From a paper:
By contrast, MdfA from Escherichia coli, a polyspecific MFS multidrug transporter in the ubiquitous drug/H+ antiporter-1 (DHA1) subfamily, can export physicochemically disparate compounds that lack a common chemical structure. Moreover, the coupling between drug binding and deprotonation in MdfA is surprisingly flexible, as a functional MdfA variant can be produced by simply rearranging the substrate- and H+-binding protein residues. Toward this goal, we carried out structural and functional studies of a triple mutant of MdfA, E26T/D34M/A150E, in which the substrate binding and protonation sites are rearranged and yet the multidrug transport function is retained. Our results revealed how this redesigned bacterial multidrug transporter interacts with different substrates and suggested how the antiport function of MdfA tolerates the rearrangement of both drug-binding and protonation sites.
The best diffracting crystals of E26T/D34M/A150E were obtained in the presence of chloramphenicol (Cm), an electroneutral substrate, at pH 8.0. The resulting structure of E26T/D34M/A150E has been refined to 2.0 Å resolution and revealed a transporter structure that is similar to that of Cm-bound MdfA variant Q131R22, with an rms deviation of 1.0 Å for 387 common Cα atoms. Q131R is a fortuitous single mutant that was identified during the crystallographic pursuit of ligand-bound MdfA, which likely represents the wild type transporter when protein-ligand interactions are analyzed. This structural similarity suggested that our E26T/D34M/A150E structure portrays the transporter in its inward-facing conformation and the triple mutation E26T/D34M/A150E did not perturb the protein structure to any significant degree. Located approximately halfway across the membrane bilayer, the bound Cm engages in a number of close-range interactions with the transporter. Specifically, the O4, O5 and CL1 atoms in Cm form direct H-bonds with the side-chains of A150E (OE1), Q357 (NE2) and S232 (OG), respectively. Moreover, the bound Cm makes van der Waals interactions with the side chains of L236 and F361. In addition, the nitrobenzene moiety of Cm appears to interact favorably with the side-chain phenol of Y30, since the electronegative nitryl group of Cm is 3.3 Å from the electropositive edge of the aromatic ring in Y30. Thus, given the pH (8.0) of the crystal solutions, our Cm-bound structure of E26T/D34M/A150E likely portrays a substrate-bound, deprotonated transporter. By contrast, the bound Cm is 3.0 Å from A150 in E26T/D34M/A150E at pH 8.0.
Residue numbers in the entry: 14 to 400
The structure:
Amino acid sequence: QALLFPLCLVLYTFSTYIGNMMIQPGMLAVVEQYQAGIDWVPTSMTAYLAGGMFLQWLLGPLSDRIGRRPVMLAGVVWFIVTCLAILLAQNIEQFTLLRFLQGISLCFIGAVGYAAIQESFEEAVCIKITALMANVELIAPLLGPLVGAAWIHVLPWEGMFVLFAALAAISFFGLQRAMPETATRIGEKLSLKELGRDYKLVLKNGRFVAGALALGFVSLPLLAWIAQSPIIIITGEQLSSYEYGLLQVPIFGALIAGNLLLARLTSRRTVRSLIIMGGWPIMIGLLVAAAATVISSHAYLWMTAGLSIYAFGIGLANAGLVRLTLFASDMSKGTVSAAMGMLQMLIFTVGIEISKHAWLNGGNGLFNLFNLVNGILWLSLMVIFLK
Ligand SMILES: O=C(N[C@H](CO)[C@H](O)c1ccc([N+](=O)[O-])cc1)C(Cl)Cl
Ligand SMILES: [Pr+3]
Ligand SMILES: [Pr+3]
């Protein structure tokens, strides 16, 4: 009778995710409205993700000391305010700063929201909620760009931010009445020296770092495609909004297909064999995209096929590498999760920006060549990581 709590956390999580996914196709309308160059399109996502890594390391220990309730509720409010505030941005620089401020809201989901879930419910009921949250993460990158392309076809980009704020408001009120206080160290002081030392400690573990870096590198081509596909397809190939959306279907559908095969194979395959199994489509897909576009710069259908094959591999291999990276360090899971989360976002932010310059200077060929080296770096780390 009190399932309002995990339900409203799912709603909030969903809203921060479309806070990125719906926005990207709208970015072409944003830069036209500010009369800014196309180079600002991928940067919207870069700033959002950079904000997502800013406070990651702090919120867990802090909410443990002052309460999961006030910290979680504060994050929801912060998202509401920054979503509305971007309506007042006067140039693309100001717009990009607010994307960064919005992205900080991402830190509250894992470090305090999910921490509260694990502390409240039975381990059997905890699996049901976790699975549901995983479903949302899988559905957002498919539906997001589709709904976002449909939105700006009829409605202003500003309207999307009003929608994000509204969904988060509903989420606030449910959390305000249903979230219990579960923080275990209320009243205790926080030492930033002890906290910083815990992070130096996790980063000393070479096998943990290899796994965490590998997760960043291997996912980068997907994230770069989310960031840049509007300018690649619409301004680069001179195609329509409809085709932009159509090309998302084989890519994110393959990702889903990869995850469903994972579920069917899990009882009769170890984590290690699934990573190796995914490596074939990961490497072949990225090779196909690169070879085709070097031969012919405008072979965007070959590019899309290569990325779908690669995306299938990710669906099969990623969750297993997450699990193994998590247990590669014997330290507290709060510290480990936050560390691996920050390492992968560091790669995403820097990688998208490199990817942007690669595309601007050399087109689809360079875009896909850079994705290929990221695949090679994942593979290089797995030869070491797996033993
Ligand atoms: O895009 C992915 N998701 C992972 C983890 O969910 C990635 O770390 C990520 C996290 C948050 C995010 N966002 O809300 O902007 C995007 C990617 C795929 Cl690699 Cl599954
Ligand atoms: Pr310490
Ligand atoms: Pr400690």
